[PDB]
Amino acid sequence: KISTSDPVRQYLHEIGQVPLLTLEEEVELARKVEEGMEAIKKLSEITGLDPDLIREVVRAKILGSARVRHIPGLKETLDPKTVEEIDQKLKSLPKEHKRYLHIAREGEAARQHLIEANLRLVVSIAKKYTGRGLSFLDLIQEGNQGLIRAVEKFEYKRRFKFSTYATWWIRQAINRAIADQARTIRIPVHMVETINKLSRTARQLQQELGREPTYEEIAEAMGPGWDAKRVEETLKIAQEPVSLETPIGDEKDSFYGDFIPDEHLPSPVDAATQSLLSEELEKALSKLSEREAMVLKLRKGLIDGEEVGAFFGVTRERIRQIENKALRKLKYHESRTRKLRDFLD
Amino acid sequence: TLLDLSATELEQVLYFSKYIVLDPKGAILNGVPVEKRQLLTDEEYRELRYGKQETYPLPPGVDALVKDGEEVVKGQELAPGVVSRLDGVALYRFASILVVKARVYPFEDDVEVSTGDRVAPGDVLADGGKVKSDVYGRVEVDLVRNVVRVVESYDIDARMGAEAIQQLLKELDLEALEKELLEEMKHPSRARRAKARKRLEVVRAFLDSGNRPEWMILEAVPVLPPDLRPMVQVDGGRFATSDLNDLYRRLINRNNRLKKLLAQGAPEIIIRNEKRMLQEAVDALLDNGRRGAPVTNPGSDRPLRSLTDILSGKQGRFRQNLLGK
């Protein structure tokens, strides 16, 4: 029905059913998580296999079958033959090392469980970074990627709980998304925190003057290197795009795009121009000595192009010689039979 | 119509949210057998894969009448203050107690079956062939209390979303449903025969001439040309771009966030939450408004234009809406 309520119902149902007991429940999952890490690393040690493969082979058996490996990540890991062969090596590990996969499997089990239980925390957080230019669901989910980031670095040894820790790792993820995505034209996190301060500073300024501040006053208030040219520009880049398709004039049936002209495409006038221009620019090119005419024609007309480096073997005295003598003979006869005189464009 | 699924609501049921339709097979019951094509709720579904789980409190200071491994008694008061549901074993951290439906197979010699393996009655679990598992389900090799508990959920293909429908759509041998309907058509009464004509129509064309039906599910979204969704310099520093580009971003961002969510690790509430968003977005570029209406940001509570409606506006009923060169 309405996509907010059933998700809320979805995880709020789960936090309600699985609120994590303050100290205990988080303590267990957390320590289990860390033993998974160590386990995985000592596994890489005894197997010569990378931790990325241990995290993923143990994730496959605990989180999903062939299904999850084949569709999400295309295909470099045969889910069956590859993952089960990995599981093989793990079994071979005697009573000693085997203990580490057995631990690793739960290590992650515990992991996902904690992420589920705190989805509430995200939504409650995410709830306030609402009208920033991001969808409630979008906000909630990047905040979610934030809580996961948190689960990776949480050291239970340091007594503080995951609540205060997820708060920060989440607010960071959210704020980064808001800056990095909210707009059409991308703008780095600096122009973002920059422009927000301008508007912030603005509001404060209006509190006094009853005069929407001249850019002079925004420069000041902002600080060290702020000048008119800066505020004006920022206020321009901050100006988001206009929708190419807006109801125009009377709202009836008027799209905005019909009004915008075309600028690469040569209107018929231009097609006619470059027709004669090349037709007769080509006539002059053939009637001239190819030596320095083609040199300057191709070193200025074909690809981009330097006097000395312009002529093949002959130096600059014959370049300047023919360039300036052919170019003028060409121009003074073009003066007689005025074809080019009418400045083509 | 083609896939015989309640045409309207059975789809929006699995499609946009999580009501999972049992695709190939699912041995464990609800009360009855495997619902080849029927759909169930996440609440009952949850009841189907972990087994059963019900944890309960302790007043500050009371002791439980049951021990660590003493199987909870069907319909027993685990500790003063609570009344636990039927099949289980009793567990307890220093506040609450926890019930479990799978039977405990205490092992003292090391457990070699690994957590997660699919198990059927007999599959070795621990202490060599001594500890054999007698029930169907996943494996949970707990080692605090040295034990091997076997959950009861056999592999049940519970799937939701276009994933589920893509499957169902590939598995159909239209020529079977054609013959099957041809006879449901002419023989029974008009009620079920009539609705069968209607369902035979689509299947006939698919097969007749043209292309096959697996393609109705999208996994590769074509993107309209760029010069057709310009980015242009207007006046002063203002840029104007085709609404479509704001939808495309949506899709792209969600699609990406998805991938990163799969690789990072995957709490499944979070993967579906986005798989939904993703679906909605996939709609948006195609056709906006048949379900929920997208708006870039305050200024225009105006539905972002969309492919579908660009084409329509072309020749649709209005005075000549946008008809004329």
What secondary-structure arrangement, pairings included, does this model have?
The structure is cut from a larger assembly and holds chains A (345 residues) and B (325 residues).
Chain A: H1 5-17, H2 24-47, H3 51-63, H4 66-70, H5 79-92, H6 95-117, H7 119-126, H8 136-153, H9 162-181, H10 189-209, H11 215-222, H12 228-237, E1 242-243, H13 268-287, H14 290-302, H15 307-310, H16 316-336
Chain B: H1 9-16, E1 21-22, H2 42-49, E2 53-56, E3 90-92, E4 97-100, E5 124-126, E6 131-132, E7 139-140, E8 149-150, E9 158-159, H3 162-171, H4 174-186, H5 190-208, E10 231-233, E11 239-241, H6 244-264, H7 268-286, H8 307-314
Helix pairs in contact in B: 4-5, 6-7
Strand content of chain A: under 5%
| C-alpha Rg of chain B (nearest Å) | 28 Å
Based on CA inertia axes, which overall geometry of chain A fits? elongated
Query: Biggest sheet of chain B, open or closed, and with what strands and sense?
Result: 3 strands, antiparallel
- What's the helical proportion of residues of chain B? 25-40%
Percent helix of chain A, as a range, is: 55-70%
Strand element count of chain B: 11
What is the CA–CA distance across the termini of chain A? 62 Å
How many DSSP helices of chain B?
8
Q: What is the makeup of the main sheet of chain A?
A: none
Count of distinct structural domains of chain B: 3
> Cα distance, first to last residue of chain B?
40 Å
Q: What is the number of domains of chain A?
A: 3
